[PDB]
């Protein structure tokens, strides 16, 4: 109710950017996509100057996901389509770590919020791997029976992860004892594309069936279902803060939902068969970064 | 009769060959259009690149996910595949799936073209160098880090005639016709032989050879290979999988002679992602380095930290070799083309999609015989 539209504050014109993420202080943000290049921008410059990446790291493979470290401001993890999970330093543009245990494309990478050195990745080889940023050996390894599209640490604890796989379900694993998932979430008609956590207990997921869904990871029952966007084949992007959800579409627009209302509380049109590739909330603030298949980055803000 | 192979080249996940009569054949991964067939479909077997027929293509080389070719008779250079950041050379970031003529380099008498991962260099008959692509790490040698879409002469080589140049992922290494060795670009692993780990924006002479004049140079990802006028390899750079082949995993920041091969004259060299091949003047192919996919071609999947002679059926002498990122190709004295290493994209040209750890014949050439898509 407090917000009914999205105001554009900035824009960056290039192609497709698949992952866009703020850092621990929300001062910088990094973008990664088909360019085989991690581009780190200063947010203040982007929203003030009428833009130029302040750091550029080159890679030998197209990137799929991107995750900043939480207590090491300058460290950012990336996953490429050859299954190489690299931890970079944006101050020295150096690859601090390289993990090559995935035999196929690595779809998701995520730094733990509570234990900064833990990094969970999930790849197309149907493997979830947990690395420590001290050794180049997978600390934990979960073998599953479907392609893993998203992996996400619980915000409140590094011992629990959510794995959104192509098995149409979300496996909630307790890494302290990996025999069967601590929970299995069903109700998604197509593969699960994105997994996020509103809080320690609320999990939001987005599938390739134009459907978002809440879930009480403390329990095994769902909460709500959100429809109103278009998502059939593309990783349109999902982002979440403590109250709102936001996702992309194959109609070149970003839809924003309230976690208590199923109908989209609002949407914005980028204004061609383009689609929204990446979305990211800035902390709990109403500002947001969004990126489509043209490589056009826009900064949006919820407003009345 | 069969059409013999004049040239071979290998890229990230694709391979290319130039056959007698100047027929360009290409195969492997083509999802970025680097195969030049007008479509993104992969080619598990050698597929004639009909677009270049009759262009008198005199040579062809492969980048990461792009390919370039040049015809001296037509004095033209064609490029296709991943061509953004200006490495296409057309003045715009176009990634079309068929060969297109680089007009910015039209009419230039090109002696050689080396394709890096995101940049290319062109040595003209006068011993000059012209470079284009992206210059994030100063690899173009222009003295500063700004991208260029047009072949720009490297003014750092005023009055110096360059025999050849080799381009790595983010670094390059030119060799002057007088025998000197130059290195510039991403040098943060000892890549450049300059005695430190700083990336240079200009061609810098490599003094750490002891007066040894260099004839050839090949750049991998984070290592470089150099052959002297009358000696053997002088490898240097990142050595984590033994790709320098010195018997250990110690990286070297300056040209370090590979003593294991000091007993034979080396005719050609090549370097891939993390492996190295060295072809002697006697036709023996030695391989070492990363061997996860079998790309060293020694019959196993164990990383080889010292040179190992790659054995071919009936003891054929090898006349040419070319290393891809994870695969290798070789043309033998009998005009047989063998391919080994990773083949998950059919870049080995055998017609399968399985990995081979030792030389396998490409019968189609040898005389003897998208993105952001959610998985379902």
UniProtKB/Swiss-Prot annotation, chain A:
Extent of the WD repeats: 15-50, 58-98, 101-141, 143-183, 187-225, 228-267, 272-304
UniProt effect for mutating residue 62 to E: 5-fold increase in interaction with HY5, weak interaction with BBX24/STO and BBX25/STH, and at low light intensity shorter hypocotyl
Region (Binding of human TRIB1 COP1-binding-motif): 233-235
Disruption phenotype: Abrogated induction of DHU1 in response to UV-B. The double mutant shw1 cop1 displays an enhanced photomorphogenic growth in the darkness as well as abnormal accumulation of HY5. The double mutant dhu1-1 cop1-6 phenotype resemble that of the single mutant cop1-6.
Processing and modification events after translation: Autoubiquitinated.
Function: E3 ubiquitin-protein ligase that acts as a repressor of photomorphogenesis and as an activator of etiolation in darkness. E3 ubiquitin ligases accept ubiquitin from an E2 ubiquitin-conjugating enzyme in the form of a thioester and then directly transfers the ubiquitin to targeted substrates. Represses photomorphogenesis in darkness by mediating ubiquitination and subsequent proteasomal degradation of light-induced transcription factors such as HY5, HYH and LAF1. Down-regulates MYB21, probably via ubiquitination process.
Note: Plants lacking COP1 are not viable.
Entry note about domains: The coiled-coil domain (134-201) is necessary for SPA1, SPA3 or SPA4 binding. The DWD box is required for interaction with DDB1A.
Name the UniProt record assigns to this protein: E3 ubiquitin-protein ligase COP1
Gene name as annotated: COP1
Curated annotation (Swiss-Prot), chain B:
Cellular component terms (Gene Ontology): chromatin; cytosol; nucleus; plastid
Keywords of the record: Acetylation, Chromophore, Cytoplasm, Nucleus, Photoreceptor protein, Receptor, Repeat, Sensory transduction
Effect in UniProt of substituting residue 80 to A: No effect on function, homodimerization and interaction with COP1
Keyword Nucleus in annotation: yes
Predominant place of localization: nucleus
Phenotype upon changing residue 273 to F: Loss of function. Constitutive homodimer and no interaction with COP1
Entry's Gene Ontology molecular function annotations: chromatin binding; guanyl-nucleotide exchange factor activity; identical protein binding; photoreceptor activity; protein homodimerization activity
Phenotype upon changing residue 340 to F: No effect on the interaction with COP1
Record note on what altering residue 186 to A does: No effect on function, homodimerization and interaction with COP1
Disruption phenotype: Hypersensitivity to ultraviolet-B (UV-B) illumination. Abrogated induction of DHU1 in response to UV-B. Disruption in a plant lacking DHU1 alleviates its hypersensitivity to UV-B.
InterPro entries reported for this sequence: RCC1/BLIP-II (IPR009091), Reg_chr_condens (IPR000408), Ub_ligase/GEF_domain (IPR051210)
Domain of life: Eukaryota
Pfam family, one: WD40_RLD
Repeat region (RCC1), residues: 1-19, 20-72, 74-125, 127-177, 178-229, 231-281, 282-333, 335-369
Phenotypic consequence of residue 82 to A: No effect on function, homodimerization and interaction with COP1
Annotated function: UV-B specific signaling component that acts as a UV-B photoreceptor and plays a key role in establishing UV-protective responses in plants. Upon UV-B irradiation, UVR8 undergoes an immediate switch from homodimer to monomer, accumulates in the nucleus, interacts with the photomorphogenic repressor COP1 and regulates the expression of the transcription factor HY5 by associating with chromatin (through histone H2B binding) in the HY5 promoter region.
Complexes and interactors: Homodimer in the absence of UV-B, but absorption of UV-B induces monomerization of UVR8 and interaction with COP1. Interacts with RUP1, RUP2 and histone H2B.
Name the UniProt record assigns to this protein: Ultraviolet-B receptor UVR8
Organism: Arabidopsis thaliana (Mouse-ear cress)
């Amino acid at each position: 109710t407090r917000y009914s539209r999205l105001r554009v504050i900035a824009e960056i014109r290039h192609n497709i950017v698949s992952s866009i993420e703020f850092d621990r202080d929300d001062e910088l943000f990094a973008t990664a996509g088909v360019s085989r290049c991690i581009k780190v921008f200063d947010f203040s410059s982007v929203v003030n100057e009428p833009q130029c990446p302040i750091v550029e790291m080159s890679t030998r493979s197209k990137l799929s996901c991107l995750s900043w470290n939480k207590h090491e401001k300058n460290h950012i993890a990336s996953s490429d389509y050859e299954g190489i999970v690299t931890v970079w330093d944006v101050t020295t543009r150096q690859s601090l770590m390289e993990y090559e245990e995935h035999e196929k494309r690595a779809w998701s990478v995520d730094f733990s919020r509570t234990e900064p050195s833990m990094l969970v990745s999930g790849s197309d080889d149907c493997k979830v791997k947990v690395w420590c940023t001290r050794q180049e050996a997978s600390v934990i390894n979960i073998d599953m029976k479907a392609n893993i599209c998203c992996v996400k640490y619980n915000p409140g604890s590094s011992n629990y992860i959510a794995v959104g796989s192509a098995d149409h379900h979300i496996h909630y694993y307790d890494l302290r004892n990996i025999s069967q998932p601590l929970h299995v979430f069903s109700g998604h008609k197509k593969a699960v594309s994105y997994v996020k956590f509103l809080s320690n207990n609320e999990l939001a997921s987005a599938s390739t069936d134009s459907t978002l869904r809440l879930w009480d990871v403390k329990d095994n029952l769902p909460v709500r279902t959100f429809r109103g966007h278009t998502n059939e084949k593309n990783f349109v992007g999902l982002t979440v803060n403590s109250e709102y959800l936001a996702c992309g579409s194959e109609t070149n627009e970003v839809y924003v939902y309230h976690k208590e209302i199923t109908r989209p509380v609002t949407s914005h049109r980028f204004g061609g068969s383009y689609f929204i590739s990446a979305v990211c909330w800035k902390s709990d603030s109403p500002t947001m970064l969004t990126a489509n298949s043209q490589g056009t980055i826009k900064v949006l803000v919820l407003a009345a | 009769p069969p059409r013999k192979v004049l040239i071979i080249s290998a890229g990230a996940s694709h391979s290319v060959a130039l056959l007698s009569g100047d027929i360009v054949c290409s195969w492997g991964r083509g999802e970025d259009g680097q195969l030049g067939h007008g479509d993104a479909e992969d080619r598990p077997s050698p597929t004639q690149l009909s677009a270049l027929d009759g262009h008198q293509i005199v040579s062809v080389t492969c980048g990461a996910d792009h390919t370039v070719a040049y015809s001296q008779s037509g004095m033209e250079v064609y490029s296709w595949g991943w061509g953004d950041f200006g490495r296409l050379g057309h003045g715009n970031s176009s990634d079309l799936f068929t060969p297109l003529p680089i007009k910015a380099l039209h009419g230039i008498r090109i002696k050689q073209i080396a394709c890096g991962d995101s940049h290319c260099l062109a040595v003209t008959m006068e011993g000059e160098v012209q470079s284009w692509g992206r210059n994030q790490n100063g690899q173009l040698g222009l003295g500063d880090t700004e991208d260029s879409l047009v072949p720009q002469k490297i003014q750092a080589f005023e009055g110096i005639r360059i025999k050849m140049v080799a381009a790595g992922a983010e670094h390059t290494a030119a060799v002057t016709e007088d025998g000197d060795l130059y290195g510039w670009g991403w040098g943060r692993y000892g890549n450049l032989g300059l005695g430190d780990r700083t990336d240079r924006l200009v061609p810098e002479r490599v003094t750490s050879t002891g007066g040894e004049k260099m004839s050839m140079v090949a750049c991998g990802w984070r290592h470089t290979i150099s052959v002297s006028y009358s000696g053997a390899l002088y490898t240097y750079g990142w050595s984590k999988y033994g790709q320098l082949g010195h018997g250990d995993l110690e990286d070297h920041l300056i040209p370090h002679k590979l003593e294991a091969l000091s007993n034979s004259f080396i005719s050609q060299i090549s370097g891939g992602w993390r492996h190295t091949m060295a072809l002697t003047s006697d036709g023996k192919l030695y391989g070492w380095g990363w061997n996860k996919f079998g790309q060293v071609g020694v019959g196993n999947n164990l990383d080889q930290c010292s040179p190992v002679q790659v054995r071919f059926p009936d003891d054929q002498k090898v006349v040419q070799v070319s290393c891809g990122w994870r695969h290798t190709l070789a043309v033998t004295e009998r005009n047989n083309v063998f391919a080994w290493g990773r083949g998950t994209n059919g870049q080995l040209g055998i017609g399968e999609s399985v990995d081979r750890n030792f030389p396998k014949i490409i019968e189609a050439l040898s005389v003897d015989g998208r993105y952001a898509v959610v998985p379902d």
